[PDB]
């Protein structure tokens, strides 16, 4: 738990405190997933399988997971309600904001697309 | 000098690779005539917003971000958009389709890193090209480059500044930040942008802002803590002389300094690298080339994987994050790592609440009357290395050890230089919502 | 043999505007020009953010009250992740972990509902608010219209209380009448304003779910087919399997990485919302 000590009386007390035998965060912080796991991950990430270095991904992920899995050994230790009038007041004050492009036809929704067909977006089979 | 300022701009741009785009007419209310740069993950009507990514290489937003709009209304001149690590992922400022930003504290042939991900932002301020810069800070991405540029870098409390139009990396952590050499300019900009925005569902409510204001008390004197867990890293040569010099100055001004232990900060990196990649994978799910941005010329599918041809143009580091993030979100890993990280994050916030005098309006802590007003913590434990060394070291296997805890807890934190043109800094940290205390303190001692 | 049948009913709400954006929720989607009723958010532009339409809360309240459901003290929206042309964010917002309401029921009687049983109650599992997706038109290139993306839906899941097929028909009929009477939806199966999925299992065998049923006639037929088809069996029906429908027969047919949305606030309603909305309810039959 968190703790506050006595006030420092002079600068040398701070120098001693900063020199105490205490480990750094660096010192405190010091079986890869299968190839089928990486391929699954690449698919969920919408990334290509062709050209992917599977073993390299396995290795990197293995290191990453070993770092975050340090959490496995760390143990563990009434908000603003929306009421009726606020519900109804909130509803009554809802409107279309020009700065959000909420008015129908206020901007060309397909205008930023590299490809389209008339007013439709297109996806190729 | 208007022609001389433009020549300086052109020279520093070519040597240090600071901007991704520049106002066609460079240097032509409250901040009238101020010049700003804007990080290129913050959308603008008048410039492309690329996120330093092939994915959005020529993306043009139909709208300005709220922070951009507020600055324009205050009469600020936007000089251009600054280079960054792709999609805000990176701490060195080296991952960009435009190439790395070079640190202008050194000759450009030295190829010293600027730090990231607000690399261009910090450089533009260090070079005296702009009066201030907006960046974003997710785990230290404003404070760290500011430290390396020897300028002020402020990350305000979570939710104070609007994220509408701020391209998402990790929404529970993302914060708009401000960089400048002048504390007076930084405070004015913060005051201009510290506003409730109804477009942003995470924007701090007007009610809560007033609650915060109403909790301010006279502190006689200010009580400052030195954090045990942050006091034992190997620091650059000369750091301790500068650090102790600053601490002695404070003590001679009648401030009280205390040792404090906040044990939960040691586990912040594993927590961060569980939650943040998960959110990133989620937020980058929209990119497919169908509605905007880059699109593969021939294929919307490959290997039975939809949008893979287009999405292959993500940077390597971005793709690394997406893959890890998706791992963390899968059913088994979620119920284990993600849920645990969330609880530890809550724990961390409770530990901060326990040592701060100021009440936390988000957790309804009472505040500790025997507690502290500010924490003083190093910004970094490393000097900027060369771009070569950084990339070499990155391919092997922490620069955010000091900055991540305040991100996780949404605390206001300002990195300040200890010496002119020296890439060494200290963070002044306050309780959630106590931004004015942090800023006024820094103003007081400069 | 015993039929254990349940229904999953998606219903388009007729709020004026959409669920997480104030863009228009159009009642004339078939004639509308494509991608016309779409905000920056609907197109999932970089930097856009969801904001909950409170009218969807009101509508969900009225339905919960009519069913006698228990409204959750806290509900939340989660992200259901997958890639598809009509899903611009790359995920759907839905209430997976913490639904708006739980419990409730609908009473059926022989007297009023043409049921063999004098009285039969159909229990409700839960009630969820979620986003609709865009519309895809396959012409090979597929055309995507996002007018319907982000339209509010309520998903109602019943308990497996259906034994007879007459019960299924009577329930759908009454549920349609209810949503129209509460003025929260047209309840029209023809327009897609209401969509009915089925899950069933005979005599405690593996659960099978029937998808893509366009009208009440097709639901009844798929159920009857699947019932007799399963009776004939039996190693293939040991594990759960989702099937489809083709007018004549039923044919056979991913980690969604559910994550609570990190931006949207919890739905935390004060007790007076319950009593307040109660007073605004129409007389029920």
Numbering used by the authors:
A (entry chain F): 29 to 58, 67 to 113, 129 to 176
B (entry chain A): 6 to 33, 42 to 410, 416 to 464
C (entry chain B): 27 to 165, 171 to 264, 270 to 289, 296 to 327
Paper excerpt:
Our recent study revealed that yeast Gln-mtRNAGln is synthesized by a transamidation pathway involving a novel heterotrimeric AdT named GatFAB. GatA hydrolyzes Gln into Glu and an ammonia molecule, which travels to GatB through an intramolecular ammonia tunnel. The third subunit, GatF, is a new type of AdT subunit found only in fungal genomes.
To facilitate crystallization, the putative N-terminal mitochondrial targeting sequences of GatB (residues 1–15) and GatF (residues 1–23) were eliminated. The final models of the free and glutamine-bound forms were refined at 2.0 Å resolutions to free R-factors of 22.2 and 21.9%, respectively. Based on the superposition of our structure with that of the bacterial GatCAB, the yeast GatF can be divided into two halves, the C-terminal GatC-like portion and the N-terminal appended domain (NTD). The linker loop connecting the NTD and the C-terminal GatC-like structure is completely disordered, reflecting the flexibility of the NTD. Inside this tunnel are several electron densities corresponding to water molecules, or possibly ammonia.
